[PDB]
Amino acid sequence: HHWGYGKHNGPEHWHKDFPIAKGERQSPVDIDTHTAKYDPSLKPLSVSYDQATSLRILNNGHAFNVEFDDSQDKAVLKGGPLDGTYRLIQFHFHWGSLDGQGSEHTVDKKKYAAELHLVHWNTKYGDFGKAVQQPDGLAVLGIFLKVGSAKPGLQKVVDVLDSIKTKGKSADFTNFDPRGLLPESLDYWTYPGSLTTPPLLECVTWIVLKEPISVSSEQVLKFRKLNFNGEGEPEELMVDNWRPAQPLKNRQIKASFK
Numbered sequence: 001h002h003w004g005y006g007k008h009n010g011p012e013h014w015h016k017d018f019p020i021a022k023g024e025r026q027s028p029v030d031i032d033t034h035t036a037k038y039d040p041s042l043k044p045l046s047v048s049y050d051q052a053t054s055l056r057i058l059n060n061g062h063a064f065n066v067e068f069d070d071s072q073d074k075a076v077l078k079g080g081p082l083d084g085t086y087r088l089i090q091f092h093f094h095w096g097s098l099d100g101q102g103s104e105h106t107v108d109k110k111k112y113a114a115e116l117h118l119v120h121w122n123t124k125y126g127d128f129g130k131a132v133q134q135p136d137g138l139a140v141l142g143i144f145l146k147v148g149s150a151k152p153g154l155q156k157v158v159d160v161l162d163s164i165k166t167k168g169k170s171a172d173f174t175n176f177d178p179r180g181l182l183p184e185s186l187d188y189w190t191y192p193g194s195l196t197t198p199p200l201l202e203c204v205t206w207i208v209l210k211e212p213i214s215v216s217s218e219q220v221l222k223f224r225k226l227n228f229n230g231e232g233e234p235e236e237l238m239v240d241n242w243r244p245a246q247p248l249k250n251r252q253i254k255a256s257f258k
């Protein structure tokens with residue numbers, strides 16, 4: 001039936017309703033640090049989240065999204081491998097049932113506990129919907145989460161999860177500052193790819209940060225208490241909502257550092 005992460009509608013079944021799953025530039029991929037090409041012509045990233053306006057947080061049955069007002073250039077991403085300005089529209093995570101898995105991208109086959117995706121769309125396209133019809137329509141900033149010490153900036157998110165336990169639930173979420181989620185270094189790897197969930201459109205320029213942020217065990221534990229199911233239905237814990245690494249094919253992962 002509708003796609004999911006279970007035995008019968010998981011990633012290995014997606015190709016049936018979304019043929020693009022077997023495309024040439026699918027994500028995520030495994031980043032082989034030794035094969036990545038250091039490209040000095042890559043500019044430094046420019047993240048301007050000082051005027052970010054968060055609106056709400058919702059459980060959409062696959063993960064939880066924190067949405068932002070993208071009607072104006074409040075929070076933007078520029079620099080790096082990007083041309084033009086990209087607006088932040090939402091951010092979400094992918095996580096596992098155990099600390100040893102959860103991320104979508106892997107580094108030298110190493111899986112992290114979770115992965116943060118900050119989704120942006122190219123302003124040149126007018127709206128998100130048009131942007132997804134273009135090879136350079138989106139830019140996703142990926143950040144790995146390793147279990148260790150608590151991340152203060154993530155706590156506001158952790159505290160509201162109870163209100164959005166089940167599919168379709170949403171809660172007002174204003175004044176959240178996304179800058180509290182960034183590692184201290186902005187070094188990154190970049191490659192052309194796609195959305196990691198259906199429709200799996202190959203409209204994304206992936207920018208994966210080298211330095212992971214650390215979060216406490218108790219923080220990720222709360223992610224695991226979310227439900228895939230809607231209220232009243234049988235309980236299916238929201239865990240392992242990650243897609244396995246896809247073949248790199250004829251693409252090159254570039255690094256902004258040596």
Ligand SMILES: NS(=O)(=O)c1ccc(C(=O)NCc2ccccc2F)cc1
Nearest residue numbers: 117119132140194195196197198199201
């Ligand atoms: N995990 S990830 O690659 O960062 C990712 C980012 C955004 C979306 C999204 O906006 N989906 C809804 C959607 C997308 C395109 C067309 C119609 C939709 F409803 C999905 C996955």
Ligand SMILES: [Hg+2]
Nearest residue numbers: 132134202203
């Ligand atoms: Hg596209």
Ligand SMILES: [Zn+2]
Nearest residue numbers: 092094117196
């Ligand atoms: Zn994602």
